Design a protein around this ligand. Structure first.
Ligand SMILES: [Mg+2]
Ligand SMILES: [Zn+2]
Ligand SMILES: [Zn+2]
Ligand SMILES: [Zn+2]
Ligand SMILES: [Zn+2]
Ligand SMILES: [Zn+2]
Lengths: 118, 45, 440, 115, 256, 206, 69, 123, 266
C-alpha cells in the first residue's frame, strides 16, 4: 500500500458530499419524405460549422487511409488528414451533411456548397 | 547443499531440502542465504 | 537499516547536517540522522527550465553523488499447508512439470527456489520460486499433460524496478511454516521529474540537468548544485529561505553552524555584516558568468548553500503507460494500478470536458474501443439480451419469443451489458430497441 | 529508465555526420550548418570568430534543445564569398590563435620555477 | 532483399517431353539444361547459442545453403559424350545412379587453395497471410567469390562462421525464360550421401515457376508478378495443376 | 600484382595532405576517390574450445567492385554484393536471385546470434595517387571517437621490384616525422584482394 | 555515511582530508573554520562538504558483521 | 556562350598538342596542380621531366585571341603547403614568347639540353 | 608571438593562476569549458566485486572508486575501449586495479586508495596509479572495516571525458574573471545606498587602472585580460590541464575543418 502526506485530491469523488448532504406534429409525422426539407427553403446557415469541418476531415481522412480514390492532384502529400484538407480547400469532397432539426426534419447541405469560412 | 549463515552467531551451515531451517550451534531460527560466489559487475558511475 | 527487513527503505548516500540549524533539532537528533543535503543554490532565471517551481540540478554534482539514494524493497513469501497434500513448497520450478510458469527468467534461482544475495535482478524476474500441487489429468490451456503435477505460485520482482538482491532471510513463522524475505537494493540517482523540497514549503521537481561547463559560475569557479526560480520567492513570502541561505553561506565561510532558531535576536543585518568581513556582498549577491559564453550576467545572483530534501516521489515510480493490458474480472475494463499494467481513469468530468469540446467520436472511442467494446445480440420482439448465438453454425434464436429471423447485433460497453443484466436480476427489463416508436 | 546514454553527447551515431549544410532561402548567399554532437563550447567560438570577418554579414548559432547535443549555425556572407570558405577561415584563425596560445603558455610555464 | 513469387507442381517421366514441347510453344524459348549442387549447413549443435540476436528481437536458428554448378563432364559417365547437352538427357536420369558421388562432393567442399564461386542463400518460411494465391518466400543471398589461406576450404570457413554440414543435394533440370521475367524450372533432385545417392523426385520431375522481385514492398510489382503467375496457371489448366506447397515443407528452420 | 599497407597509428588529421605534399614531386597522376569500411565481429558462443579465435574482420573496399572480405584465423573469404561481378553461371543456374545483399548486413541482421558487430572504422573521401609505375592511396580512418590513424595503400602491377619502393615510402614517412608506423606486406598461404585484406588486418592490429 | 570522495559542486578531492580534519579538531584544538582553511578548502562548497558531513559509518560499524570470516 | 566555348576549344587544342609533344618524348606533364591566378584568354601548363632537381617546373603559358596565339616560357619553383600551392620562386627575367607555328620537336630537345643547365644555374 | 598572451602570476602543483590577454571572450570561455569537460582522463569505470562484507553498498563503493582520481599523464597512449578490438578490456585500452582489504585488527581498518594495486601491464606508461596528495601518504578514504569484514574487488579503469561522467574531470574549480572594475558595464550592480561601497573589490582590481569617474563610457572596448585560476584534481598536472585543454579545443576545430573539407571534396 501507500502512506503519503502529500494531499493529492481525490478527483471524481463527489459522492462523499452527496452522502453528507442527501436531504433537502403539424407539418411532419413518422419518417415520410416530408422529413426531407427541400433545397429551396433550407433555413440553416450556409457556412460549414467547426464540427462539420472536423467530421468531414475525419471521415475523408479515414477513407483516404482506407484507400478511397482522391479527387485532387497530390503535391507529394502523404498524410490523409492534409490530403483531406486539400480536398476541402478546392472542394473535392463528395459528401453531404444531414443537419437534423430538433423536430426530426433534416436539411441536406453538400460540402461543395457549404462555405468554409473558418 | 546450500550455504547459510546464522543471524547472530554467524555460523556457516549447509542445508538440504529435508533439513529444518534452524541453526545447529545456537538454536536460532533466522538464517541468511550466503553471498553468491560469482563475480558481480558494477559500473563505477 | 542493514539488519532491518523493511518493506520500503530510502537511504541517502551522503546525508549532511544543515548549515542553518535550530537549537531544538539536537534533541531531535537531526544532526546525527539528517534528512537532506546542503546544496549550493543559485536563485536565478537561468534557462527558463526552472519555471513553475521547476529546478535545474547540476549533472556534475549528480555524478559526484548529490542526493543519490539507496532504495531497499523487501518481498515476503510463505509456504503454507492448505491441507494434507495441498502444501506450498520453495523450489526451482521446471517448465516440463509445472503449469502457468511466468514468462520471466527462473535461471537466477538456486535449488532452494531463492536467489543468492549479490545477484543483479531486473523487472519480471522470479526471485522466489514456489510450487503448489494440482489435480492430475485435467484439460486447461491446451498445454496440459500428465507431467504437470505442480503449478507455479512464484514471486517475481516488480516489473518496473530492478536492482541487486541485498539480503535473503529464511526463517519460520509462528506456525512453524518456512517463510522467506528477500531485500533487493537499487540506487535512485536524481533525474528530471524527481521531487525535492527545501525546509520552507518550497517543493519542486527537477526541470533539467546541466553539466558544470553549462552551469553559471562565479569568479571563484563555484557553480550551483541547484537553480531555483526567483518567482517562487515573492508571492510565497518565504523570507526564511533567503535568510537561511545567507546564514548558511556565513556558516560555511566561518566553519560554524548557523543558529536558525525562531525567536532569537539574530538579524539579517548581523548575518550580512559577518558575510562582509568574510569578503562577499552582504546581501548574498554574487557576480556570476553565463556558462555558455563566459559573459557576465547583467543581474547579480543570490547565491549560497541551502538545505534541500530529496522527496520520495521519483518520476520512475510514477511513469505509467498502457496500450493494451489485463482486464478486470467483473467489468472487463482496464485494471487499476501501474504495477498491474493498468489503465487510466477517463472519468465523468473528463468525459464532460470532451462533451464541451464536441468530440463525440473521440468520446465514443474512449468509452468503447479504449475500455470495453462488447458485441451482443438482441431481438426485435423483446429488447432483452437473451439471444443464443452460434456463430460457427450461423444460428440465432431467442427463447420465449421463438423468433429466429429478427435478431439484431449491437455494440455496447461490457459495463452497460452488466448493468442491463443486473437490472434483469433485480427484475427490471431494460429492453433495447433499434427503431424509433414516437416522434421527436 | 528513459535517460539517454552519456556518450551520445559527443559520439556520432551510425549514419550521421559531424556537419551538414543546407542553403537558406530567407537571405541570399546564406547557409545553415548543423553541427552534430557539439555544443556551446564550439558554437560561441566559431560564431564569434566568424563575426570578426568583415565579409560575413550574419553569424549566429543556437542549441535548439539542451537534451540534444547539436547546434545550428547560420552564416550569411557578402556576394562572391562562400560561407563554407568563411567557416574555413574562421576555423583556421581559431587554430592559429590556439597554437600561439599553447606556445605562449609553454614558454611562460617554463619561465615559472616555483612549481 | 528478394521475394520469390512461386508456384509448384510435378509431372511423370512419360509426360516430360510433352511438357517440354508445350512450354516451348508457350514461351518461344528452348529449354535450358542446368545444375546446382546445393550444400546445406546447420548451426553447430556443440555451440551454445542465444535465441536473441545483436538487437532485442528473438530469432530461430536457420539452415543456410550454399549452391553452385557442377560441370557436366562430371555428370557424364563416359558413355554419352556424343549426345549434346539438351533436354533429352533428362530421360536417362531416372534411377539413383549419378556419377557425382559423396567422395567427389567432399573433395569439392574441402578443395583438395582458391575455392570455386558459391551462392549463399538463406530462406525463411513463406508468408502466413492466407490472401495470396502464390507462395511468397524471402531469400537473402550473397556470392562467395574466392578464398585463401592454409584453412581455405569452404567447409572450414562455414565452420568458422559456426555452421556444420547437414546434407547436400544435386538438382539437374531445364528452365524456360518466358514472358516478363518468369523463370519456370523443371528438375530432378538427388541426395548425395556416403551411403549412396537417392532419387528424391522418384519417377517424375518437379515444377517450380517463380519470379524474383528486388523490392517486395512494391505492392504493384507483387500483384503484377502474381497475376502473371495466375495467367500461366490459367494457360496451363487442363493439363497440369499449379498449387501452393506447404509452408511447413518450405520452412528451412532447425526444429527442436 | 602486389599489395602492401602502412598504418600510421599516432598521426595528425593533416598527415594525409602533408604526406601528399611530401610525395608531390613523384606523383604522375590522380584518380577517383575511394572509400572503405572495417567491421569487427565478436563471436557470442558461450562455450568455445581452445585454439579458436572469436575475432572476425570484415573489410569492404568500395573499389575492386565494392567487395567484402572476411578474415578469421588466417582464413579469407571474398564476397560481393554487386550484380556486375557475379559469374554468369550462378545467375543462369538459378543459385543466385539476380541482386545480392551484403554479407555485413546479413551478419548484422540474421547471423547476429553468432557474430556481433562492435567496431566500425569508416575511411571515406580518400584519394588515389599514381606514382611512377605504382599506386599509393590515402584515407583518414574514423573510429567512433573520430580520427584513429593514417592509412597508406601500396599497389604495384609488377611484383619483381617491390621492396625498394616500400622502403622508399617508409623513408618518406620518416622525413614526414612518423617513426612508429606498422607496415604489412604479408600474404596468405592467394589473390590480390584477400592478401590486401590480410595486410589490412595485420596493419590495424597492434 | 562515509566522507565523499569529491566535492559535489566543483569536484575537488575532499575524501583524503577527513582524518586530517578530525586530527586538527581533536589534537590541535583548532576551531572548524581554521581546520578547513589549513586543509586548504577555500571555496565554501568544499568547506561545507567536510563541515556538514555526518560520518555514520562507525555507527554502522558498531553492529556485528553479518558474514564473518 | 558559343564564342566562349570556341575560344576554350582554341586554347584546349593547343594545350592538347603541346601536352602530346611533351609527353611523347618523355616529359611528365602534371595535372594534379592548380594555381588561383597565373598572372584575352590564357592557359598555363606546369611541365616537368624527372631527371633534374625537385620542386621545379617550366610554366608554358599560352595566350590566345581571335587573331594570333602565342606562348610565354618561364621557370618556376612551386611547393605545396597544407594543400595550398605557392610559387616559391618566379623567373620573369629570362622569358621568351614563341609561336605554335614555330615550335617543333628539335626545339624541344634543345629545351631539354637548356633547362638542366638553367636549373643548375638557378642556385 | 602574435596572438593570445599568457602571464602566470602564481604557479603550484595543483593550481595555476594566470592572466590571458589579447584573446576573445568566446575563446577564453571555450578553453574553460574544454578544461572542465573535454580533457581525457583515466578513472575507474568497471567494478567486479568478489567479496563485500562491509557496511557500505556495492555500488556505493563502486561510485567512490569511480571518483578516486588516477594518474592520467600518458592517457593519450591509452585507447578508448569502445574503439579497441578486444572483447571487454585489455592492456591497450584499460588499467586493471585490485583492492584487497581485510579487518585483521581489533580497531577499524581504513581502506584507502593507496591499497589499490595495479595488476595489469602498464607497458611503461605513466597511468593507473591513484593520486596521493596529503602528507600522511594515504589516499582517499574508500571504506572502513570492522574486524572480520572483507572487501575484495577488481577495478577496470578506462579513459573518458567529463561529459560522460564527472569522475573523468581533472579541472576542479576554474576561477574566471574579466573587467574587475566593470568598465565594460557587463554587470549592473545591485545596491541599496552605494554600489562601490556595498560591492567588495576583487583581487584582480589591482591589475587594471580604476575608472577616472569623469571620463565617458568606452563603447568600443571589448572583453580581454581574463584572470583564470585552474585547479588540478591530481590526475594530470595543472599546466597539463591548460595545455591539453588548448590542444583538445584545437583538435575539435581541426575536426570541423576536416569534416568540412571532406564533404566539400565529395
Ligand atoms: Mg502543483
Ligand atoms: Zn546460530
Ligand atoms: Zn426475445
Ligand atoms: Zn453462453
Ligand atoms: Zn568544492
Ligand atoms: Zn582493449
Amino acid at each position: 500500500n501507500e502512506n503519503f502526506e502529500d494531499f493529492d485530491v481525490e478527483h471524481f469523488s463527489d459522492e462523499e458530499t452527496y452522502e453528507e448532504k442527501p436531504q433537502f406534429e403539424q407539418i411532419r409525422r413518422k419518417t415520410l419524405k416530408e422529413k426531407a426539407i427541400p433545397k429551396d427553403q433550407r433555413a440553416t446557415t450556409p457556412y460549414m460549422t467547426k464540427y462539420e469541418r472536423a467530421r468531414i476531415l475525419g471521415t475523408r481522412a479515414l477513407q483516404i487511409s482506407m484507400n478511397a480514390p482522391v479527387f485532387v492532384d497530390l503535391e507529394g502529400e502523404t498524410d490523409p488528414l492534409r490530403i483531406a484538407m486539400k480536398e476541402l480547400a478546392e472542394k473535392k469532397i463528395p459528401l453531404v451533411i444531414r443537419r437534423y432539426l430538433p423536430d426530426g426534419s433534416f436539411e441536406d447541405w453538400s460540402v461543395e456548397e457549404l462555405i468554409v469560412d473558418l | 547443499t546450500l550455504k547459510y549463515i546464522c543471524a547472530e552467531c554467524s555460523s556457516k551451515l549447509s542445508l538440504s531440502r529435508t533439513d529444518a531451517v534452524r541453526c545447529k550451534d545456537c538454536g536460532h531460527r533466522i538464517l541468511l542465504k550466503a553471498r553468491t560466489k560469482r563475480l558481480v559487475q558494477f559500473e563505477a558511475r | 537499516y542493514n539488519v532491518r527487513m523493511d518493506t520500503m527503505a530510502n537511504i541517502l548516500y551522503y546525508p549532511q547536517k544543515p548549515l542553518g540549524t535550530t537549537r531544538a533539532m539536537e534533541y531531535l537528533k537531526f544532526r546525527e540522522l539528517p534528512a537532506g543535503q546542503n546544496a549550493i543554490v543559485a536563485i536565478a532565471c537561468y534557462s527558463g527550465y526552472n519555471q513553475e517551481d521547476s529546478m535545474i540540478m547540476n549533472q556534475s554534482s549528480i555524478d559526484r553523488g548529490l542526493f543519490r539514494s539507496l532504495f531497499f524493497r523487501s518481498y515476503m513469501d510463505q509456504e503454507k499447508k492448505y491441507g494434507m497434500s495441498i502444501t506450498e513448497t520453495f523450489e526451482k520450478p521446471q517448465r516440463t512439470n509445472t503449469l502457468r510458469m511466468k514468462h520471466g527468467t527462473y535461471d537466477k534461482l538456486d535449488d532452494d527456489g531463492l536467489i543468492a544475495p549479490g545477484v543483479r535482478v531486473s523487472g519480471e524476474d522470479v526471485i522466489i520460486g514456489k510450487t503448489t500441487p494440482i489435480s492430475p489429468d485435467e484439460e486447461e490451456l491446451g498445454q496440459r499433460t500428465a507431467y504437470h503435477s505442480k503449478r507455479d505460485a512464484s514471486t517475481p520482482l516488480r516489473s518496473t524496478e530492478n536492482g541487486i538482491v541485498d539480503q535473503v532471510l529464511v526463517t519460520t513463522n509462528q506456525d512453524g511454516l518456512k517463510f522467506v524475505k528477500v531485500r533487493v537494493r537499487t540506487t535512485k540517482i536524481p533525474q528530471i521529474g524527481d521531487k525535492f523540497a527545501s525546509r520552507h514549503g518550497q517543493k519542486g521537481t527537477i526541470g533539467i540537468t546541466y553539466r558544470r561547463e553549462d552551469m553559471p559560475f562565479t569568479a571563484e569557479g563555484i557553480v550551483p548544485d541547484l537553480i531555483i526560480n526567483p518567482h517562487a520567492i515573492p508571492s510565497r513570502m518565504t523570507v526564511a529561505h533567503l535568510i537561511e541561505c545567507l546564514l548558511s553561506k556565513v556558516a560555511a565561510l566561518s566553519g560554524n553552524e548557523g543558529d536558525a532558531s525562531p525567536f532569537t535576536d539574530i538579524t539579517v543585518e548581523g548575518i550580512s555584516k559577518l558575510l562582509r568581513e568574510h569578503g562577499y556582498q552582504s546581501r548574498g549577491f554574487e557576480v556570476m558568468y553565463n556558462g555558455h559564453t563566459g559573459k557576465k550576467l547583467m543581474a547579480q545572483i543570490f547565491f549560497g548553500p541551502t538545505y534541500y530534501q530529496r522527496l520520495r516521489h521519483m518520476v520512475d515510480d510514477k511513469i505509467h503507460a498502457r496500450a493494451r493490458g489485463p482486464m478486470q474480472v467483473l467489468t472487463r475494463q482496464p485494471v487499476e494500478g501501474r504495477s498491474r499494467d493498468g489503465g487510466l481513469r477517463f472519468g465523468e468530468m473528463e468525459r464532460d470536458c470532451m462533451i464541451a469540446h464536441g468530440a463525440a467520436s473521440f468520446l465514443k472511442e474512449r468509452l468503447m474501443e479504449a475500455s470495453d467494446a462488447f458485441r451482443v445480440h438482441i431481438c426485435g420482439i423483446c429488447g432483452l439480451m437473451t439471444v443464443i448465438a452460434k456463430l460457427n453454425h450461423n444460428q440465432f434464436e431467442c427463447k420465449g419469443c421463438d423468433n429466429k429471423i429478427d435478431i439484431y447485433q449491437i455494440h455496447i460497453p461490457y459495463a452497460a451489458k452488466l448493468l442491463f443484466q443486473e437490472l434483469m436480476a433485480m427484475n427490471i427489463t431494460p429492453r433495447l430497441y433499434t427503431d424509433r416508436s414516437r416522434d421527436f | 529508465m528513459n535517460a539517454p546514454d552519456r556518450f551520445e553527447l559527443f559520439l556520432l551515431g551510425e549514419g550521421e555526420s559531424k556537419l551538414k549544410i543546407d542553403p537558406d532561402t530567407k537571405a541570399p548567399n546564406a547557409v545553415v550548418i548543423t553541427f552534430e554532437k557539439e555544443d556551446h563550447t564550439l558554437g560561441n567560438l566559431i560564431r564569434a570568430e566568424l563575426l570578426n570577418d568583415r565579409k560575413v554579414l550574419f553569424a549566429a548559432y543556437k542549441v535548439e534543445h539542451p537534451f540534444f547535443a547539436r547546434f545550428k549555425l547560420r552564416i550569411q556572407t557578402t556576394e562572391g564569398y562562400d560561407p563554407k570558405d568563411a567557416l574555413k577561415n574562421a576555423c583556421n584563425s581559431i587554430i592559429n590563435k590556439l597554437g600561439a596560445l599553447k606556445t605562449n603558455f609553454e614558454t611562460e610555464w617554463n619561465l615559472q620555477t616555483l612549481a | 532483399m528478394v521475394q520469390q513469387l512461386s508456384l509448384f507442381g510435378s509431372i511423370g517421366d512419360d509426360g516430360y517431353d510433352l511438357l517440354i514441347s508445350t512450354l516451348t510453344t508457350i514461351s518461344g524459348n528452348p529449354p535450358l539444361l542446368y545444375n546446382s549442387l546445393c550444400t546445406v549447413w546447420k548451426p553447430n549443435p556443440s555451440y551454445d547459442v542465444e535465441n536473441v540476436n545483436s538487437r532485442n528481437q528473438l530469432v530461430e536458428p536457420n539452415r543456410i545453403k550454399l549452391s553452385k554448378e557442377v560441370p557436366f563432364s562430371y555428370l557424364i559417365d563416359e558413355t554419352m559424350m556424343d549426345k549434346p547437352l539438351n533436354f533429352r538427357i533428362l530421360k536417362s536420369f531416372t534411377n539413383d545412379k549419378i556419377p557425382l558421388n559423396y567422395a567427389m562432393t567432399r573433395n569439392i567442399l574441402h578443395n583438395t587453395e582458391s575455392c570455386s564461386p558459391w551462392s549463399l542463400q538463406i530462406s525463411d518460411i513463406p508468408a502466413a497471410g492466407n490472401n495470396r494465391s502464390v507462395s511468397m518466400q524471402t531469400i537473402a543471398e550473397t556470392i562467395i567469390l574466392s578464398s585463401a589461406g592454409k584453412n581455405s576450404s569452404v567447409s572450414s570457413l562455414m565452420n568458422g562462421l559456426g555452421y556444420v554440414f547437414e546434407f547436400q543435394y544435386l538438382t539437374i533440370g531445364v528452365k524456360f525464360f518466358m514472358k516478363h521475367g518468369l523463370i519456370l524450372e523443371l528438375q530432378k533432385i538427388w541426395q548425395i550421401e556416403e551411403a549412396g545417392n537417392s532419387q528424391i523426385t522418384s519417377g517424375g520431375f518437379l515444377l517450380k515457376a517463380y519470379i524474383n522481385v528486388s523490392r517486395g514492398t512494391d505492392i504493384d510489382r507483387i500483384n503484377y508478378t502474381e497475376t502473371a503467375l495466375m495467367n500461366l496457371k490459367k494457360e496451363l489448366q487442363g493439363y497440369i495443376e499449379l498449387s501452393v506447397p506447404d509452408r511447413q515443407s518450405m520452412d528451412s528452420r532447425v526444429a527442436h | 600484382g602486389k599489395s602492401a599497407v602502412i598504418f600510421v597509428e599516432r598521426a595528425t588529421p593533416a598527415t594525409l595532405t602533408e604526406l601528399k605534399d611530401a610525395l608531390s614531386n613523384s606523383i604522375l597522376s590522380v584518380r577517383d576517390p575511394w572509400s572503405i569500411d572495417f567491421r569487427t565481429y565478436r563471436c557470442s558462443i558461450k562455450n568455445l574450445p581452445a585454439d579458436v579465435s572469436k575475432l572476425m574482420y570484415s573489410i569492404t573496399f568500395h573499389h575492386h567492385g565494392r567487395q567484402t572480405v572476411l578474415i578469421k584465423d588466417n582464413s579469407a573469404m571474398v564476397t560481393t554484393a554487386a550484380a556486375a561481378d557475379i559469374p554468369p553461371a550462378l545467375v543462369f543456374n538459378g543459385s543466385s536471385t539476380g541482386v545480392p545483399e551484403s554479407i555485413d548486413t546479413i551478419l548484422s541482421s540474421k547471423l547476429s546470434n553468432i557474430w556481433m558487430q562492435r567496431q566500425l572504422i569508416k575511411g571515406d573521401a580518400g584519394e588515389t595517387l599514381i606514382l611512377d609505375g605504382l599506386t599509393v592511396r590515402l584515407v583518414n580512418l574514423f573510429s567512433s571517437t573520430g580520427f584513429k590513424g593514417l592509412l597508406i595503400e601500396l599497389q604495384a602491377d609488377e611484383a619483381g621490384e617491390f621492396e625498394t619502393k616500400i622502403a622508399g615510402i617508409e623513408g618518406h614517412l620518416a622525413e614526414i616525422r612518423a617513426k612508429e608506423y606498422k607496415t604489412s606486406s604479408d600474404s596468405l598461404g592467394s589473390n590480390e584482394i584477400c592478401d590486401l585484406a590480410y595486410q589490412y588486418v595485420r596493419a590495424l592490429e597492434l | 555515511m562515509i566522507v565523499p570522495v569529491r566535492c559535489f559542486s566543483c569536484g575537488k578531492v575532499v575524501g583524503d582530508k577527513w582524518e586530517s580534519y578530525l586530527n586538527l579538531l581533536q589534537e590541535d584544538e583548532l576551531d572548524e573554520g581554521t581546520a578547513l582553511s589549513r586543509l586548504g578548502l577555500k571555496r565554501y562548497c568544499c568547506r561545507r562538504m567536510i563541515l556538514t558531513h555526518v560520518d555514520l559509518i562507525e555507527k554502522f560499524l558498531r553492529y556485528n558483521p553479518l558474514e564473518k570470516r | 556562350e558559343l564564342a566562349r566555348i570556341l575560344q576554350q576549344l582554341k586554347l584546349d587544342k593547343i594545350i592538347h598538342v603541346l601536352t602530346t609533344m611533351f609527353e611523347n618524348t618523355g616529359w611528365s606533364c602534371s595535372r594534379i596542380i592548380k594555381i588561383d591566378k597565373p598572372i584575352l584568354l590564357q592557359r598555363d601548363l606546369f611541365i616537368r621531366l624527372p631527371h633534374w632537381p625537385l620542386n621545379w617546373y617550366l610554366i608554358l603559358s599560352i595566350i590566345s585571341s581571335k587573331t594570333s596565339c602565342v606562348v610565354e616560357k618561364r621557370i618556376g619553383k612551386i611547393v605545396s603547403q597544407r594543400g595550398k600551392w605557392n610559387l616559391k620562386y618566379l623567373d620573369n627575367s629570362n622569358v621568351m614568347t614563341v609561336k605554335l607555328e614555330s615550335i617543333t620537336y628539335q626545339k624541344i630537345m634543345i629545351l631539354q639540353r637548356t633547362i638542366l643547365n638553367r636549373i643548375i644555374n638557378h642556385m | 608571438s602574435e596572438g593570445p598572451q599568457v602571464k602566470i602570476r602564481e604557479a603550484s602543483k595543483d593550481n595555476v593562476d594566470f592572466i590571458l590577454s589579447n584573446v576573445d571572450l568566446a575563446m577564453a570561455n571555450s578553453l574553460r569549458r574544454v578544461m572542465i569537460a573535454e580533457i581525457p582522463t583515466l578513472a575507474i569505470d568497471s567494478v567486479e566485486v568478489e567479496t563485500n562484507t562491509t557496511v557500505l553498498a556495492d555500488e556505493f563503493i563502486a561510485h567512490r572508486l569511480g571518483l578516486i582520481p588516477l594518474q592520467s599523464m600518458d592517457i593519450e597512449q591509452l585507447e578508448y575501449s569502445r574503439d579497441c578490438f578486444c572483447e571487454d578490456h585489455c592492456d591497450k585500452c584499460s588499467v586493471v586495479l585490485t583492492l584487497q582489504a581485510f579487518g585483521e585488527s581489533e580497531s577499524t581498518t581504513n581502506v584507502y586508495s593507496k591499497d589499490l594495486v595495479i595488476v595489469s601491464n602498464l607497458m611503461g606508461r605513466n597511468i593507473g596509479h591513484p593520486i596521493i596528495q596529503d602528507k600522511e601518504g594515504n589516499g582517499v578514504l574508500i571504506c572502513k572495516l570492522r574486524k572480520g569484514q572483507e572487501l575484495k574487488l577488481t577495478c577496470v579503469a578506462k579513459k573518458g571525458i567529463a561529459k560522460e561522467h564527472a569522475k573523468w574531470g581533472p579541472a576542479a574549480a576554474i576561477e574566471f574573471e574579466y573587467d574587475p572594475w566593470n568598465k565594460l558595464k557587463h554587470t549592473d550592480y545591485w545596491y541599496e545606498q552605494d554600489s562601490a561601497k556595498e560591492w567588495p573589490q576583487s583581487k584582480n582590481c589591482e591589475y587594471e587602472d580604476p575608472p577616472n569617474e569623469g571620463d565617458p563610457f568606452d563603447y568600443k572596448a571589448q572583453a580581454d585580460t581574463f584572470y583564470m585560476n585552474v585547479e588540478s584534481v591530481g590526475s594530470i598536472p595543472v599546466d597539463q590541464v591548460v595545455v591539453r585543454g588548448i590542444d583538445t579545443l584545437q583538435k575539435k576545430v581541426a575536426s570541423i575543418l576536416l569534416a568540412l573539407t571532406q564533404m566539400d571534396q565529395d
